[PDB]
Amino acid sequence: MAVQISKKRKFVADGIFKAELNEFLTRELAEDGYSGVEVRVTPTRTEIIILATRTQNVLGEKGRRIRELTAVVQKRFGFPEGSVELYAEKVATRGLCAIAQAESLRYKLLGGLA
């Protein structure tokens, strides 16, 4: 690499990247029961896995919202066009995932029930 950044700060930068992506999707997909993100980093290919519950809801109609999310990620982080691909997965037995149930409990709390 021309920049040839050192590994000590390369790992830290990657971790900050994961935290920033995690919080961004937490704000975006709160209604969708978002639970976490797995990033599969490879040379020339970057597959990012979004673990949620309502995968159809988070995919949207004809994948419009996942498309614009891919464009958002590419523009914000400066990745080459087409290098990143977002995939949506459904977590089996989502009751055991605290984050998803916490989001559901938060939405139930704001709903108005006791």
Partner: protein
Amino acid sequence: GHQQLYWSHPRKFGQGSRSCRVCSNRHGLIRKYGLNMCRQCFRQYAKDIGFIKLD
């Protein structure tokens, strides 16, 4: 020329140069290892980054 001196003061160093990438705060920051984040944010995102209190 308002734009000639609206932000003409040099921001090449000092606390007002570097700011938290999450809070836009200029206090309790860490520039070591290129964190560029406040201590509160670092504690909040330590697990996400990879820092774990092994010892």
